[PDB]
């Protein structure tokens, strides 16, 4: 097709590489392409430098580290349930202080996980993604005291885990208090320990009104610095011997130790700019020439006093300014856990250094790597920020990678999540997207990186602006923090430009967020694009400017949930983003240099480049994503094709010729349909199933182990007792199902026998056995069958045994068998559909094509959406998307309507006119007049004031078409819909919430150990939860007997449930319940608390609910 | 009043704090056992420290540690630091914890329960029903009413006995 494209704003810069926040940060933390001696003191290098040297006699210092090559490639780890990682070696040397002996050694520290090209990891075989943390930047802040209007709190804040919070308050009693590790003491003391003297403090702080006198405590200047330090140590360690070396040690570790206290490079810079001073290191003071020299305490104190007096040039700090909140990317988060594991390793170093032969000690004999290996393994496997990768479709993976959580280790707890945190702070402009975020508890705590936004070296989020000088808009693009941004008047990206000059007497701009009308004389910068304000997902929404934010949120998030369809289509109405997204997400393959295409295969594409070489790109085909959607690439060139560098070679999943294809373009009618589209339900035509629209491919993984038992071995066998050859048809000789077979619920996928245990036969067994003359076999059927409501076609089997080469399983495991089962999923009643403007609904009815409304040329509509979904929801975008889609149905073209720079109504109506001629002049030529029904509908349209009275049938029909409306026949009857109806092309997706995954029922099944209540959830064949509020429902109905069933027969009354099952299978009405077991549990747990709980009858005489079994 | 002081500390029946082997043959076990094990080791070392006539400093320390063992067993976290199992930050789950809260015995298993003969699925308008009906998927119904179906299957010819009919829907 031709792709008409709307828009006037030309986009100076492209979207920056979209996973840079991950790939860059990890690179920077690893410095693995940097030659050792050239490394900076950052990332894991900085961790090493922080831990080492390690003293005490014996010294152990650190030279350098190196990262070798991955023992296995990414695909291999994904299969073998491994971790894609690199060996970590560190060249270390031991020195004896006296002897001078120096024995050197490169010691191996275990493995560190490596980030893949696309920005994700692989932990024990599964793709994971490390989410960036948002938090309060270290630094010095002044926040108002909330009790005492005219007083303020100085807060000195380090990095997480690298120091204590310090507060400086002016008490109602006049003396300046420092709070540290939750202890308030007069700051005067610490000021003394710093070498300060009432001379220096008097001259520095005398200016400020009467404040300095609250710092004057004569009883403090009375003491030399050592005496003051010991006063403080007793004040901070009550009882601990105030020994001199010990107090210097503690206070140094509290305030000057660079290996204990740490602002960021950010905390450093922020304090530098705030207090108008320069720091030496990254701590609050130093130890020089034997004494303590101040760095931050007095500057902070002066700023505090000036804020309290009222001195100009001092203000409190908006702690939600994106200038005071920074991002901890993957490298920082991993490095912190590195730092920790290293500290533990260092404790082990000092331990082994104390005892053992102090001549025969090498670095190897001193280093237990396991503390560090463990810390890293933890941070990747059980961290809050280490999430299972969402690779539902390519876009979902990308979006995940660009997420920002306020939660996690060292972050907010959900209890500590107020409003202001979750607010859309003004400085979110161009940095954090104000739409993409979850509806629910996590609202505003999980956010998305805005599209053009970037995270700088210090961790702040920057966004780009064009420079404007004397009304010329340069191409010089500056990325700013929000502290930077607050300095300028910044025009809006849409302000009109002749050439490169601002052609408007009045222009729309921001100063410090505040919206303002200014002259091009005052304009210092201008936005790059509207695209710059929203996340990638939000950017994928055409007509976003016509949608209320609440449903744009739902369109945004729901795209994440699109299932890759076997016949996916790019949307008829795109935003322009759809191509870059397939690119950056590594969906597709592209041409690496110009070339001629040699070979093209279901499995491989071979390209002959301009260097005469041959590259053989192999295609991932029908692989199973984290969510079981099919990640599979298809070849999109053919033998002989000439291709330029960056030309598409293979479409990924959800890609159509390199465009993001999250769904289908279906033909919608927007009308009620006999309630079948009530309250957001959706009607569809059987045609959609016939032509295989909204059909998706899914694979489940099934695993089984045969292990070594006290009682003998489990074995994977075809020879399973008491089964018919019926049960075994599809099992190869070793008991594993055969590739190709159709497997249904109940079918065996992998055979297995397990040994029976002390199966002392109940007399009924002995007699039954005798009657039938069959020894009860040694072993029993424990094969892996297909769970209820699952099934499909077996497509691979993996088998790993003990004694096979390359293979070593967990101890006791004899063999592991995996069976992959694929299924083609047609769309079905109760599967979920959505569109990009938050219109969502489940499919409620599939009519056969002849019932579908049709156009007079005989064409049925594909989908019928209820209008009542629109007005309340205020997402008119879909409406426009349909009108445009109408035109492109008959002209045969797609479109690109950028957000806030899109196709306006009159242009859409131009297009609709061209369409109408194509749709109606056809009929005129083929020799048919206007149908009688069309006359009737026109009459009704005339009363509705939608056409003008007097014009002709063709004139009036064109008048409707221009409004998006067409005459529509009810295929049930052939009578026309009484009015004209909105019909057009809409892009609609099948979200991951398919009913096949959700339907579930349980008669009876597994119960739990202590409660003897039923397990929960589909996977466990569990029971629904009848909670407190359901109980209230039953109580308020007075269904005492129904209620009592839920509390007794239907769970955790053992006697009652066994008895009920037998009665129902014998046609007998159900017994009376007895005591629920979990009450007996309560009684016993109270006994365990030394409390006597005692059931009583009306005579106040005990009743035994343990039927004797607990009394002697 | 003295009964607010403990001499004999009761122990909960083991099934209510099990040591279970799971699918893999590995063992899972409830925190109470480590709490009791703390308790019993400290008590035993106290009986021995008494037999061997140890100084006051030492006996006193042991007694303090014994009280805190009882404290962790009964209401861990209540006084002082909460007992953690080695190399973890997670507090151990004590009898008070088992009892109290949204997650405790009362609210979690006593005022509401999971139940048998129950299911869950996606809903769909179905405007044809009359006010008193609902559409129910067949497969859902078959499982929800499974025992009644075993019976009725036997009453007609569809299987010889209950056990055969149940084999016939597997």
């Amino acid at each position: 097709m031709e792709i008409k494209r709307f828009g006037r704003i030309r986009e100076v810069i492209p979207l920056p590489p979209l996973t840079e926040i991950q790939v860059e940060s990890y690179r920077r933390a690893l410095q693995a392409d940097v030659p050792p001696e050239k490394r900076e003191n950052v990332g894991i290098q900085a961790a090493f430098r922080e831990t080492f040297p390690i003293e005490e006699g014996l010294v152990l210092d650190f030279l350098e580290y190196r990262l070798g090559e991955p023992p296995f490639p990414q695909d291999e780890c994904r299969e073998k349930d491994l971790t894609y990682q690199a060996p970590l070696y560190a060249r270390l040397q031991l020195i004896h202080k006296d002897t001078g002996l120096i024995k050197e050694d490169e010691v191996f520290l275990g493995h560190i996980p490596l980030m893949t090209e696309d920005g994700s990891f692989i932990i024990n075989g599964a793709d994971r993604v490390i989410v960036s943390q948002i938090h309060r930047s270290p630094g010095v802040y002044f926040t108002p005291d909330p009790a005492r209007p005219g007083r303020y709190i100085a807060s000195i804040i380090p990095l997480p885990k690298r120091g204590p919070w310090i507060d400086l308050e002016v008490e109602p009693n006049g003396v300046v208090s420092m709070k540290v590790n939750k202890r308030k003491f007069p700051l005067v003391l610490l000021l003394r320990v710093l070498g300060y003297d009432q001379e220096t403090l008097a001259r520095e702080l005398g200016a400020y009104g009467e404040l300095v006198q609250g710092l004057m405590d004569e009883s403090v200047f009375a003491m030399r610095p050592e005496e003051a330090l010991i006063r403080l140590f007793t004040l901070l360690r009550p009882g601990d011997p105030p020994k001199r070396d010990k107090a210097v040690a503690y206070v140094y570790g509290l305030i000057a130790d660079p290996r204990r206290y740490d602002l960021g490079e950010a905390g450093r810079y922020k304090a530098e700019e705030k207090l108008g001073i320069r720091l030496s290191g990254r701590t609050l003071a130093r130890f020089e020439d034997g004494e303590f020299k101040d760095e931050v305490f007095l500057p902070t104190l002066r700023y505090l006093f000036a804020l309290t007096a009222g001195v100009p040039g001092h203000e409190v700090d908006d702690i939600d300014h994106l200038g005071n909140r920074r991002i901890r990317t993957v490298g920082e988060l991993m490095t912190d856990q590195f730092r920790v594991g290293l500290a533990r390793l260092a404790r082990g170093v000092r331990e082994r250094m104390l005892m053992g032969s102090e001549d025969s000690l090498t670095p190897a004999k001193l280093v237990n790597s396991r503390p560090l290996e463990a810390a890293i393994r933890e941070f990747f496997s059980r961290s809050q920020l280490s999430q299972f990768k969402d690779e539902t479709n390519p876009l979902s993976s990308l979006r995940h990678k660009r997420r920002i959580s306020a939660l996690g280790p060292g972050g907010l707890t959900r209890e500590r999540a107020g409003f202001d945190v979750r607010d859309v702070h003004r400085t979110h402009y161009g940095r954090i997207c104000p739409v993409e975020t979850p509806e629910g508890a996590n609202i505003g705590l999980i956010t998305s990186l805005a599209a053009y936004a970037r995270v700088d070296e210090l961790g702040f989020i920057r966004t780009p602006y064009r420079r404007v000088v004397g009304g010329v808009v340069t191409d010089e693009v500056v990325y700013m923090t929000a502290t930077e941004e607050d300095r300028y008047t910044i025009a809006q990206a849409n302000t009109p430009l002749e050439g490169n000059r601002i052609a408007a007497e009045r222009v729309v701009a921001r100063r410090k967020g505040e919206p303002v009308i200014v002259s091009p004389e005052e304009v210092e910068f201008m936005d790059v694009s509207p695209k710059q304000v929203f996340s990638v997902n939000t950017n994928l929404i055409p007509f976003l400017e016509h949608d209320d934010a609440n449903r744009a949120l739902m369109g945004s998030n729901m795209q994440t949930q699109a299932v890759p369809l076997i016949r996916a289509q790019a949307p008829v109405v795109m935003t322009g983003l759809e191509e870059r997204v397939v690119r950056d997400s590594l969906a597709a393959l592209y041409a690496e240099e110009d070339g001629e295409v040699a070979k093209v295969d279901g499995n491989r594409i071979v390209v002959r480049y301009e260097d005469g070489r041959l590259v053989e790109y192999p295609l991932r085909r029908f692989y199973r994503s984290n969510q079981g959607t099919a990640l599979d690439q298809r070849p999109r060139v053919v033998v002989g094709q000439r291709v330029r560098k960056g030309d598409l070679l293979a479409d990924g999943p959800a890609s159509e010729n390199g465009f993001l294809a999250l769904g289908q373009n279906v033909l919608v009618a927007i009308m009620p349909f006999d309630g079948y589209n009530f309250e957001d339900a959706i009607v569809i035509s059987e045609e959609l199933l016939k032509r295989d629209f909204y059909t998706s491919i899914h694979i489940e993984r099934y695993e089984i182990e045969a292990r070594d038992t006290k009682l003998g071995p489990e074995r994977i066998t075809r020879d399973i007792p008491h089964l018919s050859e019926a049960a075994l048809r599809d099992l190869d000789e070793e008991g594993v199902v055969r590739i190709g077979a159709e497997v249904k619920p109940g079918d065996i996928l992998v055979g297995r026998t397990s040994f029976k245990g002390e199966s002392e036969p109940t007399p009924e067994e002995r007699l039954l056995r005798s009657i039938f003359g069959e020894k009860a076999r040694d072993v029993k059927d424990t094969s892996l069958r297909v769970p209820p409501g699952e099934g499909g076609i077996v497509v691979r089997t993996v088998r790993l045994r003990r004694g096979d080469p390359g293979v070593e399983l967990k101890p006791g495991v004899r063999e592991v068998v995996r069976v992959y089962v694929a299924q083609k999923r047609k769309l079905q009643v109760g599967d979920k559909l959505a569109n990009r403007h938050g219109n969502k609904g489940v499919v409620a009815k599939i009519l056969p094509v002849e019932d579908m409304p049709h156009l007079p040329d005989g064409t049925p509509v594909d989908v019928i959406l209820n209008p009542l979904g629109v007005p309340s929801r205020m997402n008119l975008g879909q409406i426009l998307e349909t009108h445009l889609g109408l035109a492109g149905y008959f002209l045969g073209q797609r479109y690109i309507s950028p957000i806030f720079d899109g196709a306006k109504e009159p242009e859409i109506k131009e297009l609709l006119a061209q369409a109408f001629e194509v749709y109606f002049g056809k009929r005129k030529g083929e020799g048919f007049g206007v149908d009688k029904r069309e006359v009737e509908v026109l009459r009704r349209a005339e009363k509705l004031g939608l056409v003008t009275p007097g014009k002709t049938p063709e004139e009036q029909l064109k008048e409707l078409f221009l409004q998006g409306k067409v005459v529509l026949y009810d295929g049930r009857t052939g009578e026309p819909i009484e009015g004209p109806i909105v019909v057009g092309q809409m892009f609609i997706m099948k979200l991951y919430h398919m009913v096949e995954d959700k339907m579930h029922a349980r008669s009876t099944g597994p119960y739990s150990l202590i409660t003897q209540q039923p397990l929960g959830g589909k996977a466990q064949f569990g029971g629904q939860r009848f909670g407190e509020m359901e109980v209230w429902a039953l109580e308020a109905y007075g269904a005492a007997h129904t209620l009592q069933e839920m509390l007794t027969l239907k769970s955790d009354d053992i006697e009652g449930r066994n008895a009920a099952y037998e009665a129902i299978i014998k046609g007998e009405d159900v017994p009376e319940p007895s005591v629920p077991e979990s009450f007996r549990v309560l009684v016993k747990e109270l006994q365990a608390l030394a409390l006597d709980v005692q059931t009583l009858d009306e005579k106040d005489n005990p009743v035994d609910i343990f039927e004797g079994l607990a009394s002697k | 009043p003295e009964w607010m002081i403990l001499e004999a500390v009761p122990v909960l029946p083991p099934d209510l704090r099990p040591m279970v082997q799971v699918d893999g043959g590995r063992f899972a076990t409830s925190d109470l056992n480590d709490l009791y094990r703390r308790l019993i080791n400290r008590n035993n070392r106290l009986k021995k420290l008494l037999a061997q006539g140890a100084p006051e400093i030492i006996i006193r320390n042991e007694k303090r540690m014994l009280q805190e063992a009882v404290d962790a067993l009964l209401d861990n976290g209540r006084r002082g630091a909460p007992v953690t199992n080695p190399g973890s930050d997670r507090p151990l789950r004590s009898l008070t914890d088992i009892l109290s809260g949204k997650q405790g015995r009362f609210r979690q298993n006593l005022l509401g329960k999971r139940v048998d003969y129950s299911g869950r699925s996606v809903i769909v308008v179905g405007p044809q029903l009359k006010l008193h009906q609902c559409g129910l998927p067949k497969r859902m119904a078959l499982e929800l009413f499974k025992p009644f179906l075993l019976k009725k299957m036997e009453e007609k010819g569809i299987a010889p006995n209950v056990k055969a009919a149940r084999r016939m829907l597997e």
Binding site: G239, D240 | I57, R60, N61, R64, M65, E68, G80
Partner: peptide, 14 residues
């Protein structure tokens, strides 16, 4: 309060 500081003190007596 901290049952280890307690014992380090009682130790600090003899």
């Amino acid at each position: 309060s901290d049952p280890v500081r307690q014992y380090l003190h009682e130790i600090g007596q003899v």
